[PDB]
């Protein structure tokens, strides 16, 4: 079920921070790149 | 004066509860290993092995692609063995016949009853003779008297009974004696009075003891654990650590020496300062603990705050530290960094010179303490930090690592006697802190005057006693008190210092206790008199052994599970190492894991580190241990586990016998079975892989192929997977599910246009015995039918489960020796006796 | 090219391991044969078992080794048997880096 | 557990419109595609997962109810500088997850 | 990195600087050791990973 996800020792078992997905990041990526440009062009001459 | 250790301890409690796990069962009659099933006939009947019936349904179905499941299924089965097999006999049912002790039929493994009502007069009587023929041998074994008889029992199980008994025997002579004596030594060394009361009984003379743990332990198993270092330390202290109090010196000592000339003010204007507890005292506890470890926990760097200026505080600590801690060439107490800062704080205190000058002969190296202070010129280069030497700081030209050879544990029985204080006796401290040199302390006092202050060095002369007692106290605690399988081994002890110097790193990690600059002074004005020892001490050794044995049991399990892959590949193809021990960890005690996790959730262990540990030959034997070990042995047959590779399908007729002489059916009522006496000729079998079946079905040839093979009488055998075996008995024509149940599934589904197919191989296989029951109204014809009735599944196991038996042939099975303790003698496990003792108090002041 | 021969060799040497059933295959071997036999059947369209027993099952496996052996040697035996026929494509199976 | 039987019913005439081994170039030939392609690569293949924190025991460890070690970085207790920077981390991961 | 190899909150170690004003020229350590290795060559990658 969990091939390599098998956690043998507690050392790897930590807490959960956040989580991401394909459609999540794909959007985020674009967003960031678009802010980039507006923020510069709109910012300078 | 009130520190404990939660959450790492609530575990010690359930480990203590582990000692209670009773792994054996005491009975007066062994479980039946042989049942007799009655066909209609007085001549012959059939015997059953029971064991196999039980072993039939033990674990889950053995499915491929589920390695974890598989492992556990096995574990359960192995565990099942040592379970069913561990039992001791006591107060057996004897009978009297012609002045001889005969065994009562119920005490042998076997059931007649069923049979009794049928058998002819002659047969009956014959058996009666065999019964009063089973006599009981007397005396012998373990100096005390035991009854011996020959009763029957199932192979694998009997092996366990045997081993169990053998262990009890060992205990009775050798092992008990050892364990007790070991304690007497440990109670001498650690000052613990041990209860002998248990054997003081009176009826003792005839009491069999069942100590199930053994005491010498074996340091190895505990330290064989990967990265255990830290976890074991925690353990040592959590176990072996006393609760005490920090005593203060005489208020007068300073008042007369230091605070003497009112108008000096000096660096010791610091004396007035009381303690900011929260930070300070915990910092003093740290310094004490760390120093009483000693090289395990270092008195690392000294924190950072801007209070680091305060020249009085700094200088003061500089002196204090050269007498409080060991930079000793035998072992270390502090960080290289911590020391350097100390030497500097000291260097400044020296060439501080608020009063009349001396002679300051600076050296070639600008290095702090390269100056000889005049008159006699005591060059303070000898008060520098050379770890490999000890040179300045405490110890120095002293011996602290000595070896009083015989001592418990063999955890290299060394002894740290701080500043030569061979503290083997009860301290005062009103006396003992008399004419005691330290050399380092002594030379400190010379340099202290040759350089400057007498008023300050006089406070140090008056301090000697109180300082010698803090240390004498420590020695007893370190050396005498915390001497357990949890305190570190010596080859490592000796490796701490040099590895620290080298900088290079290995498993054996120093603990980082950051300290307050000011706490140094407070520690010098606080000796340690332990008010009362930890309550775990007397029980500790038992607990130690519990952990130890539990570990080895795990190792063992894994040793066998590991090879399971090369053993049965077709079953565990997807198997990866992680799988098999996750299953071990799963079926093993949680408390034990907890102990390991202390350093595993910190250090990280690789499958490789685990294998090494498994393969390490060092096991502390217990009752549990030997039994599991032996269970695994018997459990290597696998036919003995009730899961076999041998399952074929073949067009087979159901025996339809003639019935002319109905009376002749006093025969074995033609039982019939799938159970093949032996497997087929390989050249007649057709080995099927999913792979081939795919192809055949891909050409719409699958069904056809099978048909032809069957029509050819030839046998086919799918897979090579294990498959769980089931066993059922029938009184008449079984369900078509059993008769014509095919060991595979084949379906065709049309989707889109494509059309897909699915082929699955069975995991369950049923062996059955169809007993033929007939009556007088029956015709010889009656059992024959125009067309045959077919049976496809046939299995093979070279393990005699069910078999045709005569009658006089019943008692045959008696081939197994048995030992049973006299009912008038007493048996009792005194495994719990090992925690009975008392912490021997201190004289107090 | 040498790789081709090494493969065809490994395969044969592996088949030799298949003595007479009572065997637990060396895990390693299974893997190899499977990959090969698989690919071979995908190009030969013949029915090669990984564990033959019948005879016709054995013949098929031998024939495979034969086909490979010849291909590795670069030989074209032609019509020499009614029961066997050489598949020239055997070379393409042996040229595929997918077989160890 | 299913397999594709290349069984074609006498009723069914198949109509396949696109073959599978796709020509890499047609995708990468599109001018100024780089970004779009990349994003596509993410949106299609990038799985779903969670960020794990290390073990608290990796830094500080308790010896006594009163005695515990302190990691040189006590600053590592800072609560994530909003998404303002949390996203800023997502950038990092995503950045190395896509070579140069 | 440089700025911080150079920030000593404890006792200071021998920092034997290099002729170049470029960061990481020094050799801190009682055994020297270049910090020039952790510079930043893109054709080598001498400082960062792999």
Swiss-Prot record, chain C:
It comes from the Viruses. It is found in: Virion. Homotrimer that assemble in a complex of 260 capsomers on an inner scaffold composed of VP3. The VP7 protein is one of the five proteins (with VP1, VP3, VP4, and VP6) which form the inner capsid of the virus. Belongs to the orbivirus VP7 family. This is Core protein VP7. The chain holds residues 1 to 100 of 349 of the full protein.
Curated annotation (Swiss-Prot), chain D:
It is found in: Virion. It comes from the Viruses. Belongs to the orbivirus VP3 family. The VP3 protein is one of the five proteins (with VP1, VP4, VP6 and VP7) which form the inner capsid of the virus. This is Core protein VP3. The chain holds residues 252 to 351 of 901 of the full protein.
Curated annotation (Swiss-Prot), chain E:
It is found in: Virion. It comes from the Viruses. Belongs to the orbivirus VP3 family. The VP3 protein is one of the five proteins (with VP1, VP4, VP6 and VP7) which form the inner capsid of the virus. This is Core protein VP3. It comes from Bluetongue virus 1 (isolate South Africa) (BTV 1). The gene is Segment-3.
